[model samples]
Target: NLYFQGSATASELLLTAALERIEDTAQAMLSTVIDEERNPFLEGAPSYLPGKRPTDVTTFGQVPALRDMLAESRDLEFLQRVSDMAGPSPRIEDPSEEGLARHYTNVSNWKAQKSAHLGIVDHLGQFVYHEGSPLDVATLAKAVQMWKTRELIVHAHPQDRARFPELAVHIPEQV
Candidate 1:
């Protein structure tokens, strides 16, 4: 197992690596809560979720706690959700390679779908929401998606995180 004092999510939250990646509808994600320090206006801007802080401490102060947990069916569940979101990901069939295709999901389409899936919590994860922020369908769905995405990172094959530089790529190692 990789030696990490804290999870990847928190590292991104605590360091200079601000998303620098993410979105749905094939455009850049509109994030209001860009960072913890700058733009103090994000106080209670979105719905709030109070989770116990991790044992490790940092100057960031009470950031959203979403990692260091796992479930048995995380892989299957994550893949299933990704499939659902991606929606019948058809492989590009060229005239020469009409039948078989090594390339299954189109990079652009896959990225778009990936963005849509992760975009759910893009805003909520950064800021505490207003008190009366009801758990509507959209929010509820996105929350679940966020949880799945977290699982995707936390439970991912160790090398994939670093190799692919995926969601969990920024995990701070002992170095």
Candidate 2:
């Protein structure tokens, strides 16, 4: 019973769960951990390592990328966009434990590195097969949807706009 009550914390929690689920799914589908470089929210911040001071190294937090996700999830603008996209009383459905269990099972069945990298992105994109997080229903909704929402906002696409619809929050009719 994951329901959004217009609470930012609740949304953040869902986003965190969604991220965990994504990593799990990627591990299952690709048999490799997600490529952190391609994921802005999941990637660590650039650090000044041994180059300047041989002994000085910035340590990453317990959940390195979680810091960014929580920051952006709390953005007023993003919250408004999510509200619009999700609408009031939107339904959210968690993936079945059985299905996810199968994913874990398949992970052991099988198993790439620049062209390999491209394929990673390509393959990874397909891994998110759900809707928006804290808003709509689907397995890939929360974290992935939020990221896609930001991506579509940063890189405009009319067709995607029509498909996503919630992006209208950021655009004025005059523009």
Candidate 3:
């Protein structure tokens, strides 16, 4: 059911070519079925079924023209696929009790799970830069605070001032 758009990537090109071969095989197999009703793939589906029956038969087969049209439209030559690149390993440790409580307090329907608490830790992980990248502690700190505030907002009920508190804890209020 998932439709992949045509891609120029090497992987996609390979997949497209493979799919074309498969389609050709299917057409060859379907060509042998003469009675239409005897075709297994079309026996029960609307694409193969004859006209609507009285609550008894609802199946149909693809009309010859429709099947031919579909086959013609398919591109078997060009396909592309992309492999995912590996990302950096995670380093954040467990969340503190305050962090857990704060996370759960914001959950109006249920207690926050370990996954929710991990958001705070994930934000901290983003602060780390690669060896050659520029080190901007102030900017990194601001990003961390932004993510922390977002977590708090979600974990703390908006009405409960004490539970969510303000972002002031992350920054100097006066400054």
Candidate 4:
């Protein structure tokens, strides 16, 4: 019986070193939470309170409106609007494991940047994905759906109000 195989020590060492650096960077960033002064009047703010927290909401919470916006506007137009609101984009030089770890550590540092430039946290979950094993798309989708539903319901009054507030605000007079 032969149990001999090519050595993977060098590769493993390199990976370990890179991961260590990433971990260190991540820790440094995470050490402090970034505070992006948010406005209550903005679309990203939750429409309701005393229900689900804003942090708990997902992309789907604004999907209906987001879809409409996407349909009506070009990508650049949307991006420009976001940029005008948020500020400059955060520097994301690293997408590698190390880069991601640093990002996870200081997610708040980028919050203002994300909120302002992105208008929302569409790619926020990428940090979670980077910090660990790969995520299952189906599972993520289901989880997001449940989260969004909860957030939207809580924020919007009657279910109809969730998607069409203008209509909800205008009640028809009795005939």
What tens digits encode model 4's per-residue C-alpha lDDT throughout 1-175? 0442211111123435535543443232222111122111224433222244355333432334333322322345444433433334334446667665765544554343333211232365431211121122322222222223222232323453333232111111210
Q: Compared with the true structure, what per-residue lDDT tens digits does model 3 show for residues 1-175?
A: 1342211211223435445543443333233232222222222322222343224323111223223212221212100000111112222222656544544443421222212211222355541222222212222232233323233332323353343333221111111
Tens digits of per-residue lDDT, candidate 1, 25-119, equal: 11111221221111111223332223422233221223222221112113455445555545554544443342233233354555555543322
Deviation of model 2 at 131, angstroms? 24
Model 3, position 175, has a per-residue lDDT of 15
TM-score winner among the candidates?
Answer: 1
| CA lDDT of every candidate | 0.32, 0.31, 0.27, 0.31
**Which residue pairs in model 2 clash with each other?**
130-140, 131-141, 132-141, 133-141, 133-142
Pick the winner on lDDT between candidates 1 and 4: 1
Off by over 4 Å in 3: 1-7, 11-21, 29-39, 42-55, 59-175
All candidates: TM-score: 0.27, 0.26, 0.16, 0.21
* Tens-digit per-residue lDDT, 1-175, candidate 2: 2452221111333445545654444333222112221222222322122343213222212223333434455456555554444334322233467545654443332110111110112354552221121111121123343444444333332444443333211111111
Over 4 Å off, model 4: 1-66, 72-74, 89-175
Which RMSD values do the candidates have, in order?
Answer: 18.4, 17.5, 29.1, 19.5
